[PDB]
Amino acid sequence: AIIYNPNKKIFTLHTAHTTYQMQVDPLGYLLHLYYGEKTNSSMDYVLTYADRGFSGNPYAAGMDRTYSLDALPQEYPSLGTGDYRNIALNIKNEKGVESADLLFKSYEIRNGKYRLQGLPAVWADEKEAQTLEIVLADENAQVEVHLLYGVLEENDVITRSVRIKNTGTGQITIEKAAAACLDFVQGEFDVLRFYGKHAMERNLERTPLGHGTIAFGSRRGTSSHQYNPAVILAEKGTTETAGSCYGMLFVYSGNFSCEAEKDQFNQTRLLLGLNEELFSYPLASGETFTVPEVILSYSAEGLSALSQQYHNCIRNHVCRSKYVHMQRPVLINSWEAAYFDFTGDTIVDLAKEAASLGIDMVVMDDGWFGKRNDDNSSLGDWQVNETKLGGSLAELITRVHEQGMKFGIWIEPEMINEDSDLYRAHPDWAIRIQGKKPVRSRNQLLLDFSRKEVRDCVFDQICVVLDQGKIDYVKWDMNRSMADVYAGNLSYDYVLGVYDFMERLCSRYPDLLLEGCSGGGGRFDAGMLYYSPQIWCSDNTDAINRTRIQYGTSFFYPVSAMGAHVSAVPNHQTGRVTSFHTRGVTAMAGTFGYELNPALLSDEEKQQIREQIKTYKKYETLINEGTYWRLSDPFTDEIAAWMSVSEEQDHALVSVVRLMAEANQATVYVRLRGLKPDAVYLEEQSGRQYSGAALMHAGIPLPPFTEEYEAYQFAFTEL
Amino acid sequence: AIIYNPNKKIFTLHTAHTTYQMQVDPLGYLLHLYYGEKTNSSMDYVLTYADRGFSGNPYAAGMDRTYSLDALPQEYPSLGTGDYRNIALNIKNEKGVESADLLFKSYEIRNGKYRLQGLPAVWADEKEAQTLEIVLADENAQVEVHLLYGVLEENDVITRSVRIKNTGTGQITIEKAAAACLDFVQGEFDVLRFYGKHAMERNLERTPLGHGTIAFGSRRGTSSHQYNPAVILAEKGTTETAGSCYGMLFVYSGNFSCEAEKDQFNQTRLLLGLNEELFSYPLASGETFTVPEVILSYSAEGLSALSQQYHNCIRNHVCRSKYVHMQRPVLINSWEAAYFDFTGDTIVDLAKEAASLGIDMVVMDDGWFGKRNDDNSSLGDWQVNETKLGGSLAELITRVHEQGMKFGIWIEPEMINEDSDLYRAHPDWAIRIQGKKPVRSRNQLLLDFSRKEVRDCVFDQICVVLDQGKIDYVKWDMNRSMADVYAGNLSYDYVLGVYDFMERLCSRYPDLLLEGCSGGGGRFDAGMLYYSPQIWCSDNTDAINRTRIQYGTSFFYPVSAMGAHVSAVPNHQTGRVTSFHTRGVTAMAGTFGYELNPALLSDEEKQQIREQIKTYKKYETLINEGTYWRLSDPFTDEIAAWMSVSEEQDHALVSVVRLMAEANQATVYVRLRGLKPDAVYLEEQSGRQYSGAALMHAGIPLPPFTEEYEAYQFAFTEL
């Protein structure tokens, strides 16, 4: 629900269990009053006013020294109001002045959920959602700012976006534009962020917010491996199952900044949106710019509920693929199996092997195009290497279909190698600075996807390939960060180009299962999930490390989105050995699939594949649609444990991987969550029965281990 | 409810929201299965068995090395089973052997709540409570042990006691006897205990339980100022409003020991009961010994709920006084007002002063008897000093009644000074060791209250005094710890003597308001609360320190039990100055009352007394009967804040004392608890209205302070 009280100038947003409230003050500033547990109260009483030294006053406050935007909580604070905190908006006007001082002009409440020009965004119908659009303006900056709030009641989600219009005659530049700001007048908080590196993404870092700013971001042209565009502000003491916590998730696959600051008056400001760095976005007279969306949510009941709200929102209101609600073929991918050393016959052999085991699809990964026999050539030359494939792609696809298997293929359309026909013809299509030799990364360069002619060339090549036969699946990868950034519009316009190509591709090929990739999880974000219902979670396929990566990814993203494959050992990234069974349990917390040559496996491991596939298919709906619960913290605990529970709470699958081993082992219990306390549950394999209450308070004892890194799955059914 | 499953040999105790379960194993040992959230399951599945090095086996386990009482969880573990952990029971038999190895014999389930011979205990009716009595025995020790479990469903309380019988022909000695043991097979915990000193009792200490034991106790002959006989075992992460926590409270005013231990297998054992030190209790053939009671409770919802369960249990099932459910006269006490320097005329002047202000009662404190003109003589000489009083006690009482005032008096019956007629007549009545000069403390000695003839002498003297007139109130004090302990029965038998005298006194004078005292809160325990509905909480009457003492005392004990008086400044214990208003707010979190000479006060402060009394009387029922909530931690926070809420949640009184002051003050909010989220509440003085949800999530901003240590009261009424 969205309500306006014209007398108090208060806007109230209600979801099923939360309330967000704002107010236009007597000077026209849009103040933030409240976000938290549902309330019908007017929360304007929380605002207080004192003469605070060096916190100065709008001219319009006259002699009232107690009124300062350096103290007051705001929906969209800006540089140019006298506020000295981190701010959401900076405009440099047609005369060179960095100032924006925004006052209320108008509003509208609409049924349904706004969409964003050229960008992914949460979607819903007119019954499920309402939109509030508030217009603010600065007559001196000659800017008009449209704040968009989307309210999805059942999901306990509030979205925010911004449109900025130049209302003057001269060009302005947008120098900083956040999507969302939460201003807290009170509270002690921790900041949870998800950091990492290539092949080890999304480690949880949780620290108290001390005085000053905790900040993180990306200027890589991508959402990045290093810091995901996501933040949780947890009240001190909040756990998985209790206490207040607030999320912000950026629906965007490019650059971002997140800032959390505890100020001089013990107030907290949280910002998420575009990066200020390499962002100086020109806006001509009468033109509008759109800031990408942030999804906000609140839980009074701990982190697990917060995550569940995000999982539901992403599956049902971000991902557009039919595969959200359909079985997804179990695939085998050629990359760790063969790298570049394959032929068409190799690929068909992989199909034959995989068909005998119950695998549904073979994905031919990198190495099929140009003269791509290593990673030093041929990006941009999306012509099939028929010498290597021993014939045409059409014929290969048919040979694979004759084995009863679907076919998938890898592409990397944003990129170019110097050693390519495309680069010899069009070296100026690479992103570069004139006269400067560019950074190389994996011995490749980015194509300038801000340019239509560049995108069209590559799009046409990709269409020729995909039109050769029935291709069920595409893995779209992106293997380096952006450098040599030549202008202040490029980071943003590049990503608009990517999304345009991706929308064109999905529209032309609407039955395709698109898996996003960027050296693993380098663009693991809700912007990508709007197009691809799964993303390759990491190039690290070590089961033990995957427990941490998958744990971290689960704070915002649903299991169904996490690409996860059983790979060979010793693992190719870590050198560690794990049992086949543990690799299976871990990879079932995601898309499942295989990425190895099964011909090298023992008969016993081949039979394990058969049984794994039967297990995954049996529990696929539960894993993908069920309510997810983290049952341990793999950074600190003896085990990595998680579970999925059906909507009706009548079925659950519990997964456990042991992380530590010593002699004379203590008994380890796994405590379950999300069950009905008074219901009785049957554990399948053992045939023992337990109450929900028992399973949640005492849990179940794990069988004693006899080897390292053992794993378990337990299935419970309500009697 | 109490259930026995004869086939599984499981006993289940259910309260409204909790379940406690135990089992007799195939060897006859009484194992502890579970205590926590309510469940109908059989929790025997949590038991596990492994061959654990150096954890040995009952002979009766045969060749099964996996069965060890050094590992298994037990209701009442003992020295002599092969268990090497801290234990509950040690018996030294008629041959000198320290061993007890207890096996199940029989049980009974009875309606109602057991009572204890010569001791205070929780009481209830046959509809409110059930009792389980389990009999165990060791044929070699020739001991029979009766475990008593009391179940008070609505209160979520389980009580435990023990009776130990010598079934052999020779004398045995009881060397250790706990009342309660909780064995956890799993969990990470913190231990909360309440430590202090004279004039600064019951500071909260909360630490993680590391490997080894956290222990505390008293061998002072008293429950003590230094460590209260109370413990909370909180699961890691538990707060005031969420998470599992377990309490044990000893209903006993003598010596005790508490031990919490995390063992070699990461299990936790919690024990509470009698101290092993100075305890070697002889039991002749056929005789029975009774261990004092422990009150256990569990909360799944944090520490505040746990405390509320104790408050309810103590007010409605421990305190026997009519004054639990009646107005208690507002008193003025002569001690800080006059110390020993008073006459009968002084006392009447104090009555006249106090009557003009709305005070109901004058208490003549120490100094009225013998030649007690300082604290160096006359304990034991309970004859009225008619020279000092200018006439008889009867006449004084009448003169006070003529001023419209009730009369109270102080006694200290357990004690004797060398300079007394009693000591010159009966020096052997003091506790002492023959041939050894005794410890002196406040220049006095303890009387041997284990001896009937000693108790009878003093009891008769006290009766003569109390029979002189209408005495509405007695303060029974006790001003030193026990030393020179001459035998292993003395600590326990002394306390039996105290309780016998106290029961005799309360039975003879059933309309008396008895306030317990021991240099303040030196015996602030539920054993005393069975007799006295209030106890002088501390000799520290500094308002700021009282915020900490009262906070700590509230973890187990109700506000109504805490003696608290407005005293003069500079404070006599700390030298600190506080405003009269802050002293009033702080002292209203308890019995209220005054302890100063009002003749020295300004007219403005006298008017404050008038208004304070009106305020206290207006809110007396709410403060004494309402649900109590700690709203801050005075060890860490800016404020000491608390509130009381009516049963129907339609009325609340919120109290705040500021603890810290700086310039350019930040706005401090007090967040309320225990209200109905959707109800609308009117704040009285301001006339503003708020939802419960608003008051609990955002709270209310405190008015800015202009002086140090300011205090506030806010009253809320449901509209």
Ligand SMILES: OC[C@H]1O[C@H](O)[C@H](O)[C@@H](O)[C@H]1O
């Ligand atoms: O070069 C191919 C290789 O590229 C990236 O590393 C991907 O994340 C891998 O899965 C694989 O597709």
Ligand SMILES: OC[C@H]1O[C@H](O)[C@H](O)[C@@H](O)[C@H]1O
């Ligand atoms: O000597 C009298 C004195 O004794 C103890 O200190 C009490 O706690 C005081 O309140 C007072 O009664």
Ligand code: NA
């Ligand atoms: Na302000």
Ligand code: NA
């Ligand atoms: Na300013």
Ligand code: NA
């Ligand atoms: Na200024």
Ligand code: NA
């Ligand atoms: Na500030």
Ligand code: NA
């Ligand atoms: Na603010």
Ligand code: NA
């Ligand atoms: Na604003």
Ligand code: NA
């Ligand atoms: Na601002």
Ligand code: NA
């Ligand atoms: Na910028």
Ligand code: NA
């Ligand atoms: Na805000």
Ligand code: NA
């Ligand atoms: Na990776």
Ligand code: NA
């Ligand atoms: Na990351």
Ligand code: NA
């Ligand atoms: Na900081």
Ligand code: NA
């Ligand atoms: Na960066």
Ligand code: NA
């Ligand atoms: Na980054």
